[PDB]
Amino acid sequence: SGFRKMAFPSGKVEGCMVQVTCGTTTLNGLWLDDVVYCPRHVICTSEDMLNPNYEDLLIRKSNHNFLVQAGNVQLRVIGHSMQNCVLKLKVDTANPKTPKYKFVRIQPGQTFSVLACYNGSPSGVYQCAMRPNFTIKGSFLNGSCGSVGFNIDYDCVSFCYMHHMELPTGVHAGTDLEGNFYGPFVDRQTAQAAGTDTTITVNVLAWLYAAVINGDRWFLNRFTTTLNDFNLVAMKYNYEPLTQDHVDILGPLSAQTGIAVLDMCASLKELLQNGMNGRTILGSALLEDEFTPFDVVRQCSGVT
Amino acid sequence: SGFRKMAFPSGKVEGCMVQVTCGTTTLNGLWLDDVVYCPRHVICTSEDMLNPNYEDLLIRKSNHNFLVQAGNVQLRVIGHSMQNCVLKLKVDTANPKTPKYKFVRIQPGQTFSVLACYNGSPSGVYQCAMRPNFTIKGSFLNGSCGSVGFNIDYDCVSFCYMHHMELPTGVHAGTDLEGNFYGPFVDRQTAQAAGTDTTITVNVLAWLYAAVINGDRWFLNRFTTTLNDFNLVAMKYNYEPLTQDHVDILGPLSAQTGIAVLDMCASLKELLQNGMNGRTILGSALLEDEFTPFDVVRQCSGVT
Numbered sequence: 095s096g097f098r099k100m101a102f103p104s105g106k107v108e109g110c111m112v113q114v115t116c117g118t119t120t121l122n123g124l125w126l127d128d129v130v131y132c133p134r135h136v137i138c139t140s141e142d143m144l145n146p147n148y149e150d151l152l153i154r155k156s157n158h159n160f161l162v163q164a165g166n167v168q169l170r171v172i173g174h175s176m177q178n179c180v181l182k183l184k185v186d187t188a189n190p191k192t193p194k195y196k197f198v199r200i201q202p203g204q205t206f207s208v209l210a211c212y213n214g215s216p217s218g219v220y221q222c223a224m225r226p227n228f229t230i231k232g233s234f235l236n237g238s239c240g241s242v243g244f245n246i247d248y249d250c251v252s253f254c255y256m257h258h259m260e261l262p263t264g265v266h267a268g269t270d271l272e273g274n275f276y277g278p279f280v281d282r283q284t285a286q287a288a289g290t291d292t293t294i295t296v297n298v299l300a301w302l303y304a305a306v307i308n309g310d311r312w313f314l315n316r317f318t319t320t321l322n323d324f325n326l327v328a329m330k331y332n333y334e335p336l337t338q339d340h341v342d343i344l345g346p347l348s349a350q351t352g353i354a355v356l357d358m359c360a361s362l363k364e365l366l367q368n369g370m371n372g373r374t375i376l377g378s379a380l381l382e383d384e385f386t387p388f389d390v391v392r393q394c395s396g397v398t
Numbered sequence: 399s400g401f402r403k404m405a406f407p408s409g410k411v412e413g414c415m416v417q418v419t420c421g422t423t424t425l426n427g428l429w430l431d432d433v434v435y436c437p438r439h440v441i442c443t444s445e446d447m448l449n450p451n452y453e454d455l456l457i458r459k460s461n462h463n464f465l466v467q468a469g470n471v472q473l474r475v476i477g478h479s480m481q482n483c484v485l486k487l488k489v490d491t492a493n494p495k496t497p498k499y500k501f502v503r504i505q506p507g508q509t510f511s512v513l514a515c516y517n518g519s520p521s522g523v524y525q526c527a528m529r530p531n532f533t534i535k536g537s538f539l540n541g542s543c544g545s546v547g548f549n550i551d552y553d554c555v556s557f558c559y560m561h562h563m564e565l566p567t568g569v570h571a572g573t574d575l576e577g578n579f580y581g582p583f584v585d586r587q588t589a590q591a592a593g594t595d596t597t598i599t600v601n602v603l604a605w606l607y608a609a610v611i612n613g614d615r616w617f618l619n620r621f622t623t624t625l626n627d628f629n630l631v632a633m634k635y636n637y638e639p640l641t642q643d644h645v646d647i648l649g650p651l652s653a654q655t656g657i658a659v660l661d662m663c664a665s666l667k668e669l670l671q672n673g674m675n676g677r678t679i680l681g682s683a684l685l686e687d688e689f690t691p692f693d694v695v696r697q698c699s700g701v702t
């Protein structure tokens with residue numbers, strides 16, 4: 095019993111974190127086989143950051159301009175190249191701790207674990223969701239750039255995020271590991287706004303199913319509703335519209351609890367219109383939308 | 399910016415998790431040097447669990463009764479002994495991944511990271527607080543027993559918790575690594591009740607300071623109050639009384655934000671009496687009490 099924001103164990107990623115230094119700029123890199131991946135803005139000075147031409151900046155560097163440290167042991171850089179917004183530094187030593195991995199790009203509404211690092215040293219682990227507007231509500235200070243987000247599936251690490259910057263609103267933006275930004279952002283020190291965000295409806299429903307599995311039942315009711323009449327109320331409260339594919343994704347949770355998806359939508363409808371009246375659900379006074387159906391199934395018991 | 403429930407990186411503990419099997423009972427153990435630590439109720443069958451005599455049960459075992467697996471590699475048990483509610487299994491191989499560690503017993507109100515494991519395999523990491531009534535509100539299914547809670551301080555792992563059981567209320571109870579239970583509990587399958595819980599006042603105040611550091615200021619006010627007049631309201635809302643030592647613990651946060659502790663108590667007083675009026679603090683609609691002052695300082699920037 096219980097339900098917690100739960101990250102993946104971080105050991106497999108901790109063994110890959112290095113420190114990359116160029117000039118007085120130091121951030122984190124990801125060391126897989128004989129390649130180190132880090133944000134390309136490590137090659138910027140304070141003036142370049144305002145409007146950098148990265149192709150120019152990189153052409154003026156050489157291998158010896160890049161200090162890479164794995165712990166205190168220095169790594170010998172033998173080649174450097176740019177892929178979109180990530181810098182790739184070839185080193186002479188393949189990382190002996192390289193896990194089975196792949197680079198995947200995630201969809202808005204999906205979750206991943208973040209290993210926050212500073213100066214190549216991991217400091218904390220937490221769970222994040224990619225918001226519908228392609229930002230993440232992380233916890234990052236100056237120097238955390240190059241920290242990565244990942245999921246783990248049977249000892250394979252799927253890296254999905256590398257951290258680049260904090261927007262003026264305090265939310266966070268970054269790229270996949272091919273260097274392509276999530277959302278309409280660029281790596282330069284200018285004020286950039288994310289698009290308007292929305293609540294991830296399917297995750298809210300998954301979390302209500304988690305609550306039922308755990309024995310939290312007060313919000314249930316006998317009412318059912320239709321796909322289209324619920325989506326009327328979703329629009330009014332800035333919730334994403336619900337598709338039939340979302341219902342099917344929620345099938346296992348609906349089957350395990352015996353509560354049809356469109357029955358749960360009626361309870362969500364009522365929660366949206368009347369609130370909680372001082373009560374909580376799984377320890378929250380708000381409707382939580384950063385747990386996917388997969389996150390619920392992974393963490394919760396298989397019997398209601 | 400941002401504030402998240404943040405665990406310690408779990409790699410150093412992942413390398414210590416093994417599987418211990420006795421009969422048809424399998425749980426997790428902690429492998430440090432040439433000793434495996436696990437809950438002693440691994441030696442119980444289904445009938446013994448109701449009212450076991452562990453001294454009798456252990457005397458009837460021998461070394462070969464204990465299957466220990468580190469991955470798929472089997473560990474050779476060469477000795478077994480009981481320390482309070484933990485079983486110690488000496489094995490012929492010292493764990494090559496043994497971190498610098500120590501066994502510490504924590505106080506109610508302190509936090510730690512939990513590495514949830516099943517069948518010797520880590521599955522997730524999350525943050526917990528030891529409640530004032532010596533339970534923890536974890537996320538544990540059957541088979542998670544033997545999972546451990548820890549803090550990390552400069553590559554030293556302080557183990558503070560080993561998981562034993564879930565109470566009827568769904569909260570969790572366990573021991574320190576010397577086998578001594580937190581709280582008035584015993585390892586037998588009987589219904590046991592925790593004492594009445596209370597809200598950790600000093601942590602709530604630390605979290606309000608985290609909110610100010612992050613730029614969440616709506617709940618502040620110009621009022622101040624006294625230690626004793628606030629403790630009048632703490633009692634009414636089932637909050638722990640505030641001591642002068644708690645104020646001193648909060649000094650650094652009070653100094654960094656410029657908001658005296660007894661000024662923040664006035665804001666907490668108002669939050670307790672009027673609520674939030676639809677607003678949130680660091681993404682919560684409730685007053686959060688599972689972040690210590692140390693947790694805030696560790697995660698938050700050093701400049702407000």
Ligand SMILES: CN1CCN(CCCNC(=O)C[C@H](Cc2ccc(F)cc2)NC(=O)[C@@H](Cc2ccc(Cl)cc2Cl)NC(=O)[C@H](N)Cc2ccccc2C#N)CC1
Nearest residue numbers: 135234235236259260261262263264281282283284285613
């Ligand atoms: C309810 N509350 C919520 C919190 N609200 C407060 C939030 C206050 N937030 C800030 O002021 C952050 C600032 C915003 C900004 C952005 C642009 C710009 F022109 C002007 C300003 N952004 C930064 O300074 C950016 C500037 C930058 C540098 C390089 C690149 Cl390629 C791109 C950018 Cl955009 N720097 C970083 O991202 C650091 N690489 C890593 C870093 C540095 C410092 C702090 C965090 C990080 C991280 N992570 C108050 C209400």
Ligand SMILES: CN1CCN(CCCNC(=O)C[C@H](Cc2ccc(F)cc2)NC(=O)[C@@H](Cc2ccc(Cl)cc2Cl)NC(=O)[C@H](N)Cc2ccccc2C#N)CC1
Nearest residue numbers: 309439538539540563564565566567568585586587588589
């Ligand atoms: C708002 N919601 C919140 C959630 N509410 C629902 C909560 C429902 N919770 C339960 O029913 C859990 C049950 C309670 C119980 C306890 C005693 C007793 F006599 C009778 C019942 N406890 C167990 O069955 C205990 C029984 C036990 C075995 C060995 C020992 Cl030495 C001590 C004990 Cl006490 N077993 C475990 O602890 C497993 N070792 C590991 C384990 C097994 C199963 C599930 C979880 C875990 C873990 N972790 C509903 C309202």
